[PDB]
Structures are given as C-alpha cells and as structure tokens.
C-alpha cells in the first residue's frame, strides 16, 4: 500500500466510524507517504477525532522509512509494532488505493497502475507513534497495517491494506480494548470480493514509491 485516495468529504468518514456524532483543504486522489492523510483516533484522552498526521515510520534508531506495519510481526508482536499496538492505534480513512501492476520482467520495467476500492469509504486500520505534545515529524509517523500473505489486491509483490468493518474499526480506536482484543480484530479484514479496481489511464506513478513527474 505505497499510495491511498481520501476523496470524499471528511464528514462521510466520520459518518461511518461514528453514526451520528459530527466533530478543509480539499480532496486528494494522489496520496503518498511523507504526507499528512487525514486520519482518525482517540490518541488523546480518549477523545474521538479527526486529524491528519505523518504516514511513514521512522525509528529513532534506524534509517528505515516504515510505510506498511506486517500484520503477522504485530501477532507475534514483533519490534516495533509491538510498542504501539496498544496505545497507537488509529484508522485511516480512504476511498481506495493504488497498486502498481508489473508488465514485465528486468531492471525499470513498465508498470501499469490500477485503482481498487469498495462501495463506501474504507476505515484502514493503522499504528501511529505520534502521542500528544509530539511534534509531526517522521519521528512520529504511522504505518497502514497490511496482510501481505496475501499480498496486493492486483500486485502480487504489493500488500494490501487491512479494512475494518465499523464496528471492529470502532473497536479497534477504542482505548479500552485490549491488545489481545486488538490482535484478533487485525486479521478479520474485508474480504477481496468486496473491492472493484480499473488500470487508471492517466499519471499517477510509474511505480509504487515513484511520484508521477
């Protein structure tokens, strides 16, 4: 999952995570990590909000830029997942993702996007280190919990996304719930036969962590 479309208005996410309880710079279908994708938690004082923060994870001690969180490395609760697990978890909202289709082999090889996505606004689960008081750098950035055993949507070498229903994405925000609670939720994802996806004939990318120029 290396770019996500929040399209819709953001009242419409809030809508489906939170029926009946209301809380701009306009929409985006071209949304890559390094940005601030709107999202939606109770972080702080277990209040419900919405907020964009950083996507992309990078440990304090490493060079490495976290855009995905393994969904088996938060079952074994593995490093570093496993610190935020229980007091980081947020959803992001989207209306679908891109997923870029490798047309042949070799170095630079062409590749051909595609849009997937559902018939109503998609909750992402996903682990976040930014707390409050904390700046929103990269120090503090989050990562979309994806199910990469069974990789991309359309790319096999892609990993898709883990979507809620609302009532587990409602449990999984939800502060009280345990980590063990929060595990089991992870792996009850939406099934591939609720997503549609087209190739997308116009630039997005010529590949998933390459921007269109």
């Not at 898709?160 to 792996?187: C, F, G, N, Q, Y």
């Amino acid at each position: 999952c290396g770019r996500i479309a929040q399209k819709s208005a953001p009242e419409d996410y809030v809508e489906i995570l939170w029926p009946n309880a209301r809380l701009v710079a306009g929409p985006r279908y071209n949304i890559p990590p390094g940005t601030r994708p709107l999202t939606m938690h109770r972080l702080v004082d277990q209040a419900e909000a919405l907020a964009r923060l950083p996507w992309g994870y990078k440990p304090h001690g490493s060079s490495f830029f976290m855009i995905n969180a393994k969904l088996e490395t938060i079952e074994r609760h593995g490093w570093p997942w496993k610190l935020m697990i229980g007091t980081g978890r947020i959803l992001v909202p989207a209306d679908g993702w891109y997923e870029w289709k490798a047309l042949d082999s070799g170095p630079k090889p062409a590749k051909q996007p595609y849009y997937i996505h559902g018939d109503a606004p998609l909750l992402f689960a996903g682990l976040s280190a930014w707390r409050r008081g904390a700046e929103l750098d990269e120090a503090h950035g989050f990562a979309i919990v994806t199910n990469d055993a069974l990789g991309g949507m359309v790319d096999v070498h892609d990993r898709r996304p883990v979507a809620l229903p609302p009532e587990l994405a409602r449990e999984w925000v939800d502060p009280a719930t345990p980590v063990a609670r929060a595990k089991e939720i992870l792996r009850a994802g939406l099934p591939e036969t609720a997503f549609s996806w087209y190739p997308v004939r116009q630039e997005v990318g010529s590949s998933k962590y390459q921007l269109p120029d």
